[PDB]
Amino acid sequence: DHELREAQREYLDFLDDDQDQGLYHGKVRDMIGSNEHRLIVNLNDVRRKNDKRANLMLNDAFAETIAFQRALKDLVASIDATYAKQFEEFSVGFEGSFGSKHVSPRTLTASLLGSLVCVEGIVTKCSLVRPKVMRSVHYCPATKKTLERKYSDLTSLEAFPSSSIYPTKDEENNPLETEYGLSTYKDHQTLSIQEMPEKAPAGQLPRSVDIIADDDLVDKCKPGDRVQIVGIYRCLPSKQGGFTSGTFRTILLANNIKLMSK
Amino acid sequence: AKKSQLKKRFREFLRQYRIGTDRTGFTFKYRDELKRHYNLGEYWIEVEMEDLASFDEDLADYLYKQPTEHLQLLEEAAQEVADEVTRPRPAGEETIQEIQVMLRSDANPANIRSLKSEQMSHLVKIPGIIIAATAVRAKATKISIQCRSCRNTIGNIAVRPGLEGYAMPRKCNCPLDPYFIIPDKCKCVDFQTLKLQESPDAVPHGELPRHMQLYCDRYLCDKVVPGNRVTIMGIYSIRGVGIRSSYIRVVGIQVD
Amino acid sequence: MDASEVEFLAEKEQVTVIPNFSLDKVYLIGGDLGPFNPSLPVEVPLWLAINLKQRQKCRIVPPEWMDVEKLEAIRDQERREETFTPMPSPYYMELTKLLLNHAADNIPKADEIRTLVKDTWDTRIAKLRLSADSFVKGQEAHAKLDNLTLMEINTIGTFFTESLNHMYKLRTSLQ
Amino acid sequence: MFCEKAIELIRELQRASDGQLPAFNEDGIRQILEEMKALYEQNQADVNEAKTEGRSDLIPTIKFRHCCLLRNRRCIVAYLYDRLLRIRALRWEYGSVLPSALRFHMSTEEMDWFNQYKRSLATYMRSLGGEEGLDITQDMKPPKSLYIEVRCLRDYGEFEIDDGTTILLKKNSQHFLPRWKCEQLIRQGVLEHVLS
Amino acid sequence: WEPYMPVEPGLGREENFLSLEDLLMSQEKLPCCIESGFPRLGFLDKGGDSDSIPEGSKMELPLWLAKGLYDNKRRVLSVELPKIYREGWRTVFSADANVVDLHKMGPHYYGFGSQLLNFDSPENPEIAKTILQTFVGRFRRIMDSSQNAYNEDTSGLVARLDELERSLFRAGQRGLNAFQSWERGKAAQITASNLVQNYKKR
Ligand SMILES: [Zn+2]
Known about the structure:
- This is part of a larger assembly, with chains A, B, C, D and E.
- Chain D is mainly α.
- Chain D has helices at residues 4-15, 27-52, 59-93, 100-104, 108-127, 183-188, and strands at 149-152, 158-160, 166-168, 174-175, 191-194.
- Chain D is elongated.
- Chains in contact: A-B, A-E, B-C, B-E, C-D, C-E, D-E.
- Strand 11 (243-244) of chain A pairs antiparallel with strand 8 of chain B, so a sheet runs across the interface.
- Chain D: Keywords: Chromosome, DNA replication, Nucleus.
C-alpha cells in the first residue's frame, strides 16, 4: 500500500534521530542492550516533529501501529542484524498527552472504536498466565523434511481465524511429528478495569472494560491498583451457529500499562 | 416504487412546514432545527405527530400503524434535508452523518395491562417508572464478511435495528459457512436495555405490579436512571409452543 | 447595525402599484411622485407601497424576478459556483419578506417563492461560515467578499470583526 | 498588604454590571485617603533619613510605597469615572428630570456634573439649525408609521398635547395617538406599544 | 443602542487606566523573589519576626507591584512564570485546546499571558505562540456554540470559557437573537431599555 509505504518512510525517518539530538537512537540501543522487544514512544515528540502522523495515529491506530512496528524492525536490523533475527516482530508502546482520548470506563462510548485511547481506573480481577501458540515447526520422519506454519486469532491485530492447527499428515499422508522445542509460544492474560469508586455517580453501578495483555505486559498489576492503560479499542464479533445476534462485546487491546500510585 | 414517493413526501414535509401567521411572521421549524443541531454536533431531531398529521394526514396514519419502514424513510429524508441545508461543509466533514428522528405526541397515554396482542407492530404510548438498567453495550449496524478459504469480501451489509440479527450466507459464491465477520470493518452504536414497571396507581388491588422490557439506542442511552417516572413512545414488537418474548423499541422519552 | 436599520435601507427600492384613488403629482424631497390615476401603474418607493397596501388603497404588482422559474435558475446557479453569485436585488430577503407578508393575495405562488429564497439564503450563509472559518484558520489579512448582500453580513458581523481584532492583537505583540 | 479597600470598592461596582448606579461609598474613600497619607508621611521620613544620614538601602522601600500610592490613585480615578459613565445614561433614558429614587443615590458633586452636562447638551441641541434645534434624544428607532396604538400601564395623571387638551392616563386604557408624541413615554415605561 | 458603555479592557501588553477588568486582572498574584531586601517592610510578612524582609526571600506579589518594581537590571525583583505557562502545560495545550477549562486555569488567560511578556525572559517567543495557537484552535467551537443555540440554557456552554471568550459568546448570541426576532416580526415594537426595567424591578 502506498499510504503504508509513506507512513513507514516517515516513521523510519522519525526513529533515526541520529544527526539531531540522539534520543530515539539511544533508546533503541538501550532496548537492544537490555534484551527487550518493546519501545515506549512518547507521541509528544511525534506531534512536535510530524503533527499529521500524530493525529492520524490517534484516529486510525491499526495501520499506523503496523507501519511503526515495521519501521522499528528495520532500524533494529540496521543497528544489529542478529538481534533482529532473534525476534520475529517488535512492539511499540505509547505515552504522553492524548487530548480528547483521555477517557474513563464510563465515557468510553462506541464512537471511539479503532482509536488509541488511555483509560484510567482500578483493577478488579486478573486471570492466569497461560501460553498461546504463534508458530509451530513440524517434522516428517519419512522424508526428513521440516514443515512450518503460522497461526492467528481474532484477539490480535491483523485478525484472522486460523484453523487446521497442528497438522499431522503430509501431502502424501506421511506421518508428521511436532517439535515442541522449536515452536514459538507467548503468554496471555485478561484483566478488568473499573471506574474509580469516588468518581462514580450514586445509585448507578460502576462501569467496566475488559483488556487483553500479552508478552511482557503480563503480571504488571494486581487487583486493587490504580492503573492507566493505553491501547486500541475494538469489538469482538460473536457468531452462534449460522446466526449473529449483532450485540458484539467490546475489548481493549493494550500496549502500555502504567501504575499511578506506585 | 411507492417507497420513493413516500420518501419524497417526507422530504417535502421537512422542507415546507412553517409556523406562524402573516400578522407576525413565518419561521420554518424543522429545517432550521436540523441545521442548528447538525452544526452543534447533535445529530437528532424531535418531530411531533400532530404537525405531520396537519401537513399530511395519510403520512401520519402510516406512522401509527407501520412504524418500521415509515420511520426508516423519515430518517433517510431527514439525512438528505440536513445534507442539503449545510451543503458547503468545512474541509474534512464532506461525509454526511446519519440523523435519528424522535417522535412525540399529545395523545392520552395507554396502560401496560391494556396492551393487547392486536396492537403488535404499532406505535404505543405507555407510562411507567424505571426500576432497572444495564451497561451500555455495542450494537452493529454495518458489517463486512470475508470467506475463510478464498478470502472473498462482501461489504456494507446492513443489519436491522432492534434485537434482530443477520443470518449469514451458506454458499461461498470453501466449505459450508466459510464467512467470518471482519472485526475492524464494523460500525457500531450505543445500546441499552431497561425495565419499565406499571405505575403505582394503575396496579389493581391485591396484585403485584407488572413489568416490560425496553430498548434504547444512540442518543436515547443514558437518559433515564432507575427511579424516574417516564412516558415512553415505542414500537411494540417480539424478539412453551410458539411463545415469543415481546419488547418495546423506544423512539421517544419524556422524563417527568 | 441592527436588522431594523438594514430593513430601513431596503424600504427605498422601486415597486409598481395600481392605485384606486386619484391624486396629482407629489413633489417629494427625494423625487417626483407620478400622477395617481386609478387602474394605472405608478412606481413608488417600497415604504409607500407597504403603507398604501396596509391602508387598502393600492394593489402591489410583483417584481420581475419573483418568478418560480427564475428563482429555480438562481438557486441552481448558487449551488454550483464555489464563490458568491450576483443576486437579482441587493435586498432580496427583505423584499421577499415584506411583500409576501403584507400582500400575498396579489402575488401568486407565494409559498414556492418563499421556499426557494430560503434555500438560496441557506446556501449563501453556509458559504459565509466557510469563509470565516478559512479566514481565521489561515491567519490571513484580507478577503474578497464579492456579491454579498448587507443582511448576510449583518448575520455574522460584530462577531467576525471583534474576533479578528483580538486575533490581530494576539498576533503582533512581540513586535 | 495594601490596596485591599480599593479593590473591594472596584469589585462592588463590577458586581452590578447592568448600570444600576449604587449608593456612594464614602467610608472606603476616607480609609484609602488615610492610608495614602500615612504612606506618604512614612515615605517622606524614610527619604529624609536616607538623604541626610546616608542610608542607601531605603530606596526599594520608597519605590514600593510610591507604587502603592499610584495604585491607590488609579483605583479612585476609575471608580469615579465609572459612576460618571453610569450617571450619563440617565439623561438619555429618563428624560430630563431625574426621578427622586435615582437622585437619592447620587452625590452633590455628581448632581452638579449632571446639571452642567444637561445644560451643555441643551445648548448644543439649540445650536443645531435655525430656531429650535433638532432634538437628538428623540427618534431613536427607524420610523414605520405615523399613528401607533398604545396602552397605559400605570396612572400618570393627565398628559397634554400641543393642541391644549390633556388625556387622562388611567391603567388599562388605549389611545390612537401619533408616534412622535408617545415615544418618550413608551421608553420611560408609562406606555406599551400594542401591535395588531 | 446600548445606554451604558463601560471602558473596554485593553488586550495585549498594554492595559487601560480606566478599565475595571484590567484593574482586577493585575490583582492576580505572581511568583517573585526579593533580590535586594526591603528594610522596614518585614511587617508585611506575618511569619517573619524581623522588621525588615531579608535578602533572597520569595513572595507571591501582585502583578501591578511586580510591574512597578521590575527593572531590566534585575536588582530589586525577579519574576518566575506561573505553572500554567511553563513547558509542561504548554505541551498539554498544544495537544488539544478544546478540552481544557480556561475558567479555572485563570479567569483572564489571554490577558495575563500577554502581560507576562513585559518581564523579559528567554521563553517569551514560545508563550506568545502558545497563546495565539490556543485562541486559533478554540475559535471554531466558540463560533458554532454561539451561532447555533436558540432558546436553550447556555450555562453549560460558557462554563469552560474565560472572559474574552464569554464576551465573544455574548456577541454571537446577540447577533443571532436579533435576526430571529426580525424574522418573527417582533423587531417593530418600541420597547423600553433593559436598564429602565431593571430599575423598575427595585
Ligand atoms: Zn471462499
